[PDB]
Symmetry: D2
């Protein structure tokens, strides 16, 4: 239980990758607060998974487009569990549109979920974080490799995380808080499933030939959140099957 006694906050913990992160951090001993945007039933089920197995959980409904909500959610977590040790930012909107076609609203949307709320959650978490803590952003391999049209704003929003990570690492390093950007490739989720033609075409660009699993992302995040990873900071860390080789 490498995270016994620790308190983690997961922005977007109710489904896919975020649910697996919640469950792995709890399995390792952390008490976990997480936000969900949509489904109370889904969040209830993730919470139960933490509890049936002996872990402590708080689910918080919050819209990641609303900065006030995110700040309120962090404060509510800290009232529930005490100061944070770990923040994982996993809100994320993957929408395609060409440069000449994308609507001004889908843009301003990926900006608010994928960039602005990552900063806002990080700032409020840092204000309530123990020294020796961990902040992990979930970016994308499209920060490094954009093989097709339609991903310009999505890739912009994820490469934003590279400079955020570097500069936050400098800010928070004197507190011994690490800041890292985990860059996944394709991962099998219910809205991006490993199925169909587009999945086959993506697999052809990967050295591994398969989609990643939610639990593999969660295993990397849990390593970075743990006691062996205090020297890892400022980094953009690819876990992408070789997509970006």
């Amino acid at each position: 239980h490498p995270l016994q006694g620790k308190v983690a906050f997961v922005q977007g913990g109710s489904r896919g990758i975020g649910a697996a992160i919640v469950k792995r951090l709890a399995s390792e001993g952390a008490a976990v607060a997480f936000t969900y945007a949509a489904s109370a039933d889904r969040a209830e089920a993730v919470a139960s998974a933490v509890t049936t197995a002996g872990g402590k959980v708080l689910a918080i409904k919050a819209d990641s487009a609303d900065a006030a909500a995110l700040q309120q959610a962090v404060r509510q977590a800290v009232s529930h569990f005490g100061n944070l040790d770990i923040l994982v930012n996993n809100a994320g909107v993957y929408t395609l549109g060409g440069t000449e076609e994308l609507a001004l609203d889908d843009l301003d949307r990926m900006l608010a979920v994928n960039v602005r709320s990552v900063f806002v959650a990080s700032q409020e978490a840092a204000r309530h974080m123990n020294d020796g803590g961990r902040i992990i952003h979930i970016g994308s391999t499209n920060a490094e490799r954009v093989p097709f049209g339609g991903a310009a704003v999505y890739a912009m929003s994820k490469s934003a995380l590279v400079g955020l990570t570097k500069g936050m690492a400098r800010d928070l390093g004197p507190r011994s808080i690490t800041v890292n950007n985990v860059q996944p490739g394709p991962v099998d989720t219910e809205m991006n499933p490993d199925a169909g033609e587009y999945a086959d075409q993506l697999k052809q660009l990967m050295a591994i030939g398969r989609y990643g699993k939610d639990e593999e992302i969660a295993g990397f995040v849990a390593y970075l959140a743990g006691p062996q990873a205090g020297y890892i900071t400022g980094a953009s860390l690819s876990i992408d099957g070789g997509f970006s080789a």
Copy 2:
């Protein structure tokens, strides 16, 4: 006159780097439309510099925080000069604040000038651009090297350009339009002058030991805008005195 007959649009052309870009592109033969946010007198003087020397110019007052304004400015340029060949995005806000201290408004501000309006100007320019055109974003070496605290959101906003550039290059490549991100280091301007203690400390991190000059940035932008640079696309191109080595 490698740009004879060409039409360029410069977002932020009235001062510093943007004024030097305007003057160099006009000197090479382009007709230049440029936006300015603040000073009609400054913009009038840049316009005169283009004209006294025999070039064609249009100055447009526009707030780079206002997407409608930027779209209107591009349309007004195209009515004045015809379809664009070149877009240079040089709006830019360099504000420092630690992660735990930066105000929600300074953040949402660097986001609007340094990220969102670069996309918005690019989209509207692309809709009115000839094939074989050029789009040049002005990013920063802080996308690659963040040596001190206080630059997290600034560096986020500039590393955003890396993925924008890659994805826009894919979108616009079939039109033979190149898309590049010029990443300057410190440059001697009236608001960031090569003078004082902070300038000396920055120079110590540079291999060159001096600030860059506005005309050196303009020379690189003019090369990238020209007829010898049609193979350069998707790139993030450092011109930083070795800051980021």
Copy 3:
């Protein structure tokens, strides 16, 4: 014991980071052969120490094959040999150039090739690079940094070659063992990252250059 039943080869496993890597892999249940014709081992033990130098391609090849004779095909190779010699561009001796190329670059490929000839599908190759591949703040490091940035291309291309066999290939980039965290790293932290990548949870990480540098390169 996440590495129970697995077989590892560590090039440069006799002190510092290399010794911490050998210790950690063995503690997780791997058989470990390492370099640092002579060998030492313990009866009933699963750690084999081989003295052979990282300069001669036939020797290094032979050491790999010795390990396979003891233990079977490899699952894990870690390339951790490394020579660090400072010199300005105008002054560096050609013999120092040649030593850094032979140890830091050529021996990495030689060991990787031999390992790949005798490796189970689902294996792991981990190169030990440096954060100097990304940030070179001072003079004197040009050829050292060159030798370490070489591993970035090697990793990418080796990941493409070996991916059809489900073998991952990554480049771990340490910093000192400029800093954002205010201390140097510990050998055991570098070993814990290599052990993670060597294990069963890390099959989707490939082709990557992964920095563990205290924020040196930020």
Copy 4:
């Protein structure tokens, strides 16, 4: 003639990109010596062609010094020698490994060192790398990519060493001469980028790896 009065050395200047580089630099007014004990030149001319191979460090050193005897200290060195041999990790012959290391890596440092010994302040060193240092989409390229990603660290560190002399050091990364633009590049486009970096407007560009690849690496 932005290079009037300047002296350039081009390692590998006899065909393709190298020949386009020699032509462009000379057209801008430079004296140009290039490699491709024998030499040819024209009476009254400022282009000197030297046959010496990019393998032997004393020879390459000698060619540089020959150029300095004709023309004076250098202002510009362009390293454009290059060997491209495909082979998977498991199969590549060690002699092909060794040839790519000697030509693509070691000869780049040897020429750079000799040039730096005989170079005016305010000079320029330009290495010709490859976009394969950043994107390796297919198998077969591991050692080629390794040899070319080596130049990234070299460039960074050489920029730090030579910056006090105002000498810039950059790495030009071509693509084919995956694509975003839908054609391969022309030799003369690579030469125009090298000429820009070699000129008087480019003194603030240093340490950089600068891609000219049609968007291959995007």
